[PDB]
Amino acid sequence: THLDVCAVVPAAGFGRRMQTECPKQYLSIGNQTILEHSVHALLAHPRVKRVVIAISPGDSRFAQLPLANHPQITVVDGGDERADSVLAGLKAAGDAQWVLVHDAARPCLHQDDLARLLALSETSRTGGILAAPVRDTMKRAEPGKNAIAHTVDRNGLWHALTPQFFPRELLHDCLTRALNEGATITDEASALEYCGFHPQLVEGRADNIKVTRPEDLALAEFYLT
Amino acid sequence: THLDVCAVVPAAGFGRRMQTECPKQYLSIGNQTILEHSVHALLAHPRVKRVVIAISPGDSRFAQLPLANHPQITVVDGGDERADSVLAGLKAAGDAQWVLVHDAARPCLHQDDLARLLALSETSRTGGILAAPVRDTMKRAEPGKNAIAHTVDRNGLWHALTPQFFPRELLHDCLTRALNEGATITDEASALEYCGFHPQLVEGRADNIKVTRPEDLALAEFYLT
């Protein structure tokens, strides 16, 4: 039972950066929706016993997918921001000791990256995330201007990706505390950070992209080909 | 003569992150090398009168390209690091008032992005660069560990791309000074920054990628399709 993992997939975003009245997670690549691609990647690993998917209360396309009746899938309503949807998913996680949180919008997840992340439960007490090294020179803009303030050192700088793997109750409590104290939480690692922890960085493939913009769809298809 | 622009293309990298004994800039996409794609993008704009390409002293494939005999192209030897190759190119720029520096490895440059960058000479005294907003949550790693120190705010954070457009002598002098004082210079904007300036950020397409890794080739082809 120690190895059992519960997954949480925040998929309640309206994605108004997609322009289309059709959510990005519901767009299709091959014979499946982006959401299904993401969920099947998690279900592909033996340890992932359950997947909790958080959707919008006004979401009516989920019930029309094969996942709707899957014995390992549980559906709950998400919240205003990603962190809220993730929290609602965590509350239905169960007794699982460890939780995997993965964006519905990242359908290109490979099994090797996933297995390497999952190994953290046997070598870590706080958990970690998949991540990709920064390549371009990075620039910090001036507060209210489109001019360069200074360069941000790309060395030691990483792109946070998902899944993000953490002990269930610890993540639950850190996220609740951060949100209650009105902190800025853009991922799960951010919640552990707010509570004083420092999650591990597990290098994953950079082709594990997030589909948010219209063009992202085409690119995601390319990678899945 | 005020509008005349000289371009500098650093292409002296051995690219040992490509694995192949064949430099990334010399790989082919369609009926052309990556280098030719990059150079033609600059030559496509009327203002770009000359292009100085910096290559490795041991580079023997350049002379076998059609660009070798192009009336607008000048070839010089590059240096140990990118900043050195760029400096050598600048010394052969001529009397051009403004210089455009573009990585040989970024063949997906679009004309609209280029024209918007070039407009800076009529609205700026210091210049600017093409850049793309950061999307993922960013993480700063701990000095000697693969653990997260803290999150780096993605708001106001940009991916520096190229071309980078600056007054010729100013760039020349700032780069010389920075290099002499042993500063870290990963792009041209960094040199103006070292001398106290703050270049403008011009949003460009994120598909204007840099080909450094083996897989980058395939992706670049996709974008050029």
Ligand SMILES: C[C@](O)(CO)[C@H](O)COP(=O)(O)OP(=O)(O)OC[C@H]1O[C@@H](n2ccc(N)nc2=O)[C@H](O)[C@@H]1O
């Ligand atoms: C977690 C990271 O991938 C780490 O780089 C990013 O911080 C996510 O950044 P992001 O701006 O939150 O990205 P988005 O594409 O808007 O959202 C990622 C996932 O959160 C979900 N989401 C977003 C807002 C919301 N109220 N409920 C949600 O369930 C989206 O449906 C999507 O599957």
Ligand SMILES: C[C@](O)(CO)[C@H](O)COP(=O)(O)OP(=O)(O)OC[C@H]1O[C@@H](n2ccc(N)nc2=O)[C@H](O)[C@@H]1O
């Ligand atoms: C300028 C930026 O694109 C801004 O994001 C990056 O800072 C460049 O970062 P980078 O690590 O320098 O990237 P690379 O792919 O190794 O180099 C970009 C360009 O510099 C050239 N280059 C590199 C090293 C060297 N001694 N001479 C060169 O002329 C390469 O040939 C390539 O066309």
Ligand SMILES: [Mg+2]
């Ligand atoms: Mg959002």
Ligand SMILES: [Mg+2]
């Ligand atoms: Mg280099």
